[PDB]
């Protein structure tokens, strides 16, 4: 079977761990336990293909096959600093064509300081898809992770 190595990156507190745990455990973590380094695995079916998701949850290397670049829509600075994570990845992989998805998390909150059109423009300049998610309501979570898997497939 095929295994997909996915790496979730982004600033602190944007919800990387809540996202990974919502996908894997179908459970929203209310608390904020800072991550130093964590790894999760789960067999899922994607487009009729049984595959193993291996997800590295990082704190706010070269083995990552795809990357979720996460900011929070109510955290302007986390969006302003996403370019640092993209460029870090681009450095390590030594490729301008790295499977990647731009994720705007916490889309259930009404305190939105990052406009969707702004994130769409950024994603477009990166040549990657933009997906808004909520680890709480599960909106867009499957969309984000599975879209990243499909981006790995096209590569």
Ligand X SMILES: Nc1nc2c(ncn2[C@@H]2O[C@H](COP(=O)(O)OP(=O)(O)NP(=O)(O)O)[C@@H](O)[C@H]2O)c(=O)[nH]1
Instruction: Output the known binding site.
Output: 13-18, 29-35, 59-60, 105-108, 134-136
How far is it, in rounded angstroms, from Cα 121 to Cα 13?
23
- Minimum CB distance to ligand X, residue 50 (Å): 28
C-alpha–C-alpha distance, residues 114 and 85, integer Å: 18
Tell whether residue 124 is a contact of ligand X (CB under 6 A): no
Place of tokens 């302003």: 80
Q: In the bound complex, what is the minimum distance in angstroms from residue 138's beta carbon to ligand X?
A: 9
Does 120 help bind Mg ion (rule: CB under 5 A)? Answer: no
The answer to the question of residue 148 lying near ligand X (CB under 6 A) is no
Contact range with Mg ion by CB under 5 A, out of 14-22, 69-77, 86-94, 133-141 = 14-22
Residues 135-154 that bind Mg ion (CB under 5 A): none
Strands of 100-105's sheet in order across: 37-46, 49-58, 2-10, 66-72, 100-105, 130-132
- Looking up tokens 């994570």 gives 85
Least CB distance from residue 16 to Mg ion, whole Å? Answer: 5
């Amino acid at each position: 079977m095929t295994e997909y190595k996915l790496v979730v990156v982004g600033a602190g507190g944007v919800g990387k761990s809540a996202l990974t745990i919502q996908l894997i455990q179908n459970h929203f973590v209310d608390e904020y336990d800072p991550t130093i380094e964590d790894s999760y695995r789960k067999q899922v079916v994607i487009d009729g293909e049984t595959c193993l998701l291996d997800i590295l949850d990082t704190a706010g290397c070269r083995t990552g096959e795809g990357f979720l670049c996460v900011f929070a829509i109510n955290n302007t600075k986390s969006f302003e600093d996403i370019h640092q994570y993209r460029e870090q990845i681009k450095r390590v992989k030594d490729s301008d064509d790295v499977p990647m998805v731009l994720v705007g998390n916490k889309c259930d909150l009404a305190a939105r300081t990052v406009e969707s059109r702004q994130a769409q423009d950024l994603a477009r300049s990166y040549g990657i898809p933009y997906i808004e998610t909520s680890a709480k309501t599960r909106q867009g979570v499957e969309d984000a992770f599975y879209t990243l898997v499909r981006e790995i497939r096209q590569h």
